[PDB]
Design a binder for this molecule. Structure first.
Ligand SMILES: C[C@@](O)(CCOP(=O)(O)OP(=O)(O)O)CC(=O)O
Ligand SMILES: C[C@@](O)(CCOP(=O)(O)OP(=O)(O)O)CC(=O)O
Ligand SMILES: [Mg+2]
Ligand SMILES: [Mg+2]
Lengths: 285, 285
């Protein structure tokens, strides 16, 4: 007997970092980008060596089940770097309960994914987890709620993994340390997110693309982008992408690019891997 | 013309600090404990000198309304120290919109109170604001949600203000810096909150009181209580309180004590002010 669990991932269109301060964020489920965790028997009991979201999901699950001596090991595993912190949490929790064949209502799961994220010190706005449990793009505000969005632009979004494992915590630190000097950054993002909705409302991928490139500049100035991400966006843009920006926690992670044609989309991903992206993925919009 | 806004407050029964890591928290509306803010005309435009939740509520309101030159001043004002960070935010926002006679749906308000709290760097779990907008006690978990609780113990809760202005941010820092050593603290609180629900379910004020005293010890050990708070609880207990603990952000703030008789309640508050509490208040349960 082996326990297995699997979660889908997501990608942030816009609102990264700003969501942390109560500003809206729009994100898209990545239903075909999944993560899997297996749980197996072990000689010695399971221990806690780190504050990473996986170990933390195990712990939070064990605490719940009330098991201190869990003689088990929980490894991971696709599309590697495209699985988020929450995605990993969800998968583990499921794998753990499944191993123990424990009952798991959706409320509980959601409660435990967010708790693991929190004790992993990821400082969740609640957006990652939320989107990984949704099957529709959503509009989100921390500590308040979300609404599902209609998303039909007949466009494609190309996702590229920078290869650099995102230092999300450090990124939140940067924006946090800026204090009041982040307000203009936050403000600018708040606006861009508003227009982003309009554009989406009007099914104007071009308008949208523009807004995204902008979002990237502000994310870059505030200091949470990366050279890998920046050069990938540049490549994106220098190949006719309606727009491009980094998505997620920053300081590593992924890039997203907007396009309205399939030939173009496949071309862009190729071009990107060619430039050094470890993986790519094309999502319909 | 003068703008005015008014919010009610709340008190945390249990889950302080632990709620920050995704653990449940139970809190009670304080409908008769209100805060008021007035907004008036001014010579020079309004500026931002600090990251305190009031100024932050003004800013977030102005940003929303899209007013940069707000030639206005927004002062505060009762039951002083019993008004929370969110309570102050709510009152200001209302006073500001009211001054401008701007439309304000409840969604917007709630969105702006939480945003102000966030830019004021208060690190809201969402509980303060939530309870200040509720008229029923609630069970709460960060980034997930809340449920209203039935609360009928025919008991009284005595609230005492330590006088020391709570250093809530610093307190969150302490628990944050403990890292993994806070897990046992969090765990213990998670449990206590569970029993707290049971007791409430069974209308067992004694059982409940016990749990509260315990909650105070763990809050004290982890290092977020205060001498003023501790000595007040001690006085509470040394006078037959079913239980007592600090409530709120810690490092200052208030104490709550449980009792089931009115004579006892009034007696306790007196005794407490006598010991140095700046204000007291008795809420029905
Ligand atoms: C900074 C944030 O606003 C965005 C984080 O984006 P992701 O959750 O996609 O990042 P990782 O899971 O670390 O790869 C934090 C937050 O809102 O949770
Ligand atoms: C530490 C916390 O869990 C409890 C804060 O309690 P209050 O919001 O009542 O404190 P103040 O408004 O500063 O007086 C933080 C949180 O959950 O928001
Ligand atoms: Mg994340
Ligand atoms: Mg507060």
């Amino acid at each position: 007997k082996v326990g297995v669990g699997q979660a889908h991932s997501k990608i942030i269109l816009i609102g990264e970092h700003a969501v942390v301060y109560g500003y809206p964020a729009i994100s898209l489920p990545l239903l075909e980008v999944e993560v899997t965790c297996k749980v197996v028997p072990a000689e010695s009991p399971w221990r806690l060596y780190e504050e990473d979201t996986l170990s933390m999901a195990v712990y939070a699950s064990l605490e719940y089940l009330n098991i201190t001596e869990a003689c088990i090991r929980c490894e991971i595993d696709e599309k590697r770097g495209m699985g988020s912190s929450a995605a990993i949490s969800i998968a583990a929790i499921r794998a753990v309960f499944d191993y123990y064949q424990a009952d798991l209502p959706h409320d509980v799961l959601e409660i435990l994914v967010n708790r693991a994220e929190m004790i992993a010190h990821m400082n969740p706005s609640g957006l990652d987890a939320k989107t990984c449990l949704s099957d529709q793009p959503i509009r989100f505000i921390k500590n308040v709620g979300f609404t599902e969005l209609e998303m039909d632009l007949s466009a494609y979004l190309v996702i590229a993994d920078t290869g650099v494992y995102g230092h999300t915590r450090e990124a939140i630190q940067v924006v946090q340390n800026k204090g009041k000097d982040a307000l203009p950054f936050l403000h600018a993002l708040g606006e861009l997110t508003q227009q982003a909705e309009i554009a989406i409302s009007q099914k104007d991928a071009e308008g949208l693309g523009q807004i995204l490139s902008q979002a990237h500049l502000h994310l870059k100035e505030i200091g949470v982008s990366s050279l890998e991400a920046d050069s990938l966006v540049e490549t994106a843009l220098s190949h006719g992408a309606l727009g491009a920006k980094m998505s997620g926690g920053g300081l590593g992670g992924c890039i997203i690019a907007l396009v309205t044609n399939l030939t173009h989309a496949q071309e862009l991903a190729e071009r990107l891997e060619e430039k050094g992206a470890v993986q790519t993925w094309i999502e319909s919009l």
